[PDB]
Amino acid sequence: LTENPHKKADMRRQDSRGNTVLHALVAIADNTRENTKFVTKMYDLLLLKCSRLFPDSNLETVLNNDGLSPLMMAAKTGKIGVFQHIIRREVTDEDTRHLSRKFKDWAYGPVYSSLYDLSSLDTCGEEVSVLEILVYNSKIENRHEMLAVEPINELLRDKWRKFGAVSFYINVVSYLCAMVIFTLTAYYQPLEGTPPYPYRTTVDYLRLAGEVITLFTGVLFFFTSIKDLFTKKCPGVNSLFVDGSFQLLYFIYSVLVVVSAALYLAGIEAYLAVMVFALVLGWMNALYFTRGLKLTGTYSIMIQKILFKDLFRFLLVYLLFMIGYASALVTLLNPQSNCTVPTYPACRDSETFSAFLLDLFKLTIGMGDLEMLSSAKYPVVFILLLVTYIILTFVLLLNMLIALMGETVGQVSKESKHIWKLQWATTILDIERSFPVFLRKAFRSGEMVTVGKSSDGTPDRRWCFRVDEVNWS
Amino acid sequence: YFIYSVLVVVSAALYLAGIEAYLAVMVFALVLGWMNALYFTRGLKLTGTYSIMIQKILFKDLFRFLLVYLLFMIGYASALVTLLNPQSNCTVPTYPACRDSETFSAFLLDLFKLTIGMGDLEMLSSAKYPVVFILLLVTYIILTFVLLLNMLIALMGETVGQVSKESKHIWKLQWATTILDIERSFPVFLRKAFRSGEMVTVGKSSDGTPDRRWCFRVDEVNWS
């Protein structure tokens, strides 16, 4: 069909969706052996033939309707085999060599400085990159394995060692200082609100400085949040972190600080109670930090699961069980003042509000001891029921929780450090996205023209990343 | 060992002086002394792995973990004392709030710290501002208990799956260090060395020591 003497079938032609031969050839691929083998082979065949027929342009650049590319499409759909091959492709014959990725720079015996061309793994935000799609997008299926292909891992390492790690510590220490100052300014708040204008003495000036710096940090965080919200890469592929993860925490924090500032100007009693509330949420944010280096505590994953996972419904059913027992036993025990804060301890069905006696019995059982021995007072059915309650509660809770411990410890495997690596990559990339990347802080460049010229991404300079290796072959 | 000796010597000096409140390092010396006993028991009989833990926990993730825990709890203490801040009451600390009595932050801070550490005794009272305080404190206690237990037990699992043959490798390294510093302590070249062997010709060579070539014979059995 490529060289039929009759009407030709130009490879560059694309369907209604825009998926040309390579987009579709990636759409059918999988992560198996035979499928990846033949898809990679035929991808190479098609690309080389199309380049030979039209050396003017590279076939792989023809975007679909969504604007992606075969490499980007394999990244977004989660195709490890095609992605690995297309990111480690080198072609020998010169007429079709310009469409390679893993150039060779120099060798000095057993040392090879392999120059991977990341012309399209990072665009400084100009056009969507394979790293952003790969890591920010949480709907990928093979996110880790693809994030460790070869140029990606070393690229993240290099970013870490260059405005990736220093800036992270700077930001974490700055946020910790902001939280400390928030704590101090709330604690040293003028007694019972009463927001005066007394800033004349040294300690008062210090308090004013703390308040103003706290407000400045809050407004800066809100500015960051709104900038992130407005900045959308593509409909469907975007952070969309509202009501998810932890961006909502920063948003809520800023909202609370602003509301508190308003009511502080008003100076109203029982309304600064959100100030302190802000603070608690503030320090919960510190828990979502410590996701960088040094094998950080895995709290995140647990709090990321326990928030909306089996433990939630488990504690819900536990509350239902205990409250059902509370109703059962208060009904059983329901049948002069006694000088007690709750109305009566039963006393021939005194009753009042269910919550009162319910909480009485709830705290009694939670504390556990103090017994109820008395004398006679109806048969042993009550003590029998309560002893089954305590025995089943203690035994089942301990056994199930400890078996869950075993399950999670056998489940917190290399998958856990995969989460750590993903968090580290997200930290690096949102650090870069925060400040202008295209400044003179990017990834290394390479050859200018001819041997290292091609129309794959960026001018003939072909911004390339060199990774060293040693092979005894 | 250096610190132990320094403390003993300083204490001997002040004992000659005989000054009050200065022999407190004597007892201090003793505590450190017995901590040295922990670094012993690194020889035979599958000694307790205390060392590795104390060798890690001293300057590893647990240190910063407890540091951030202290920061979290103290932040909560400041939050809740600020919330609760608003006749003598005969109490060792000045007042339990009592309309913003205040004095020194450490006083009320330690009051609330020990109250939370002990945990019980509640604070029920009546009315006294809305449920936001009790809500916050119940979140504190729930997250504290649940997260600490779950993370500590998961760390237990991680270390037990990590205390592998690598652990007995540490044991063997400690055993080797014990043997070698024992030898280095006293003159080794005395008649306590490792066996000798052939003298000349077949067992002569200029690799180390005279043609005697101090050699170590290891027996083996091979059915070949």
Numbering used by the authors:
A (entry chain A): 304 to 638, 649 to 786
B (entry chain B): 553 to 638, 649 to 786
What does the publication say?
The transient receptor potential vanilloid 4 (TRPV4) channel is a polymodal receptor that is activated by warm temperature, osmolarity changes, and many ligands. Like other members in the TRPV family, TRPV4 is critically involved in a plethora of physiological processes like temperature sensation, osmoregulation, and mechanotransduction. To understand how the TRPV4 channel is activated and inhibited by ligands and to facilitate drug development targeting this channel in the future, we have resolved the structures of mouse TRPV4 in the apo state (mTRPV4apo, 3.6 Å), in complex with the agonist GSK1016790A (GSK101) (mTRPV4GSK101, 3.6 Å), in complex with both GSK101 and ruthenium red (RR) (mTRPV4GSK101_RR, 3.7 Å) and in complex with Agonist-1 and RR (mTRPV4Agonist1_RR, 3.9 Å) states by cryo-electron microscopy (cryo-EM). In summary, we have identified the cytosol-facing cavity in the S1 to S4 bundle as a hot spot for GSK101 and Agonist-1 binding in TRPV4.
We first observed that mTRPV4apo is a homotetramer, where the S1 to S4 bundle and pore domain composed of S5 and S6 are organized in a domain-swapped manner. The mTRPV4apo is in a closed state, with the residue M718 forming the permeation-restricting site in S6. The selectivity filter of mouse TRPV4 adopts an open conformation in the apo state, which is distinct from those in TRPV1 or TRPV2. Moreover, though the subunit in both xTRPV4 and mTRPV4 is domain-swapped, the pore domain in xTRPV4 locates much closer to the S1 to S4 bundle as compared to those in mTRPV4 (subunits in green and tan, respectively). Therefore, we believe that the structure of xTRPV4 is less relevant when the function of TRPV4 is considered in mammals.
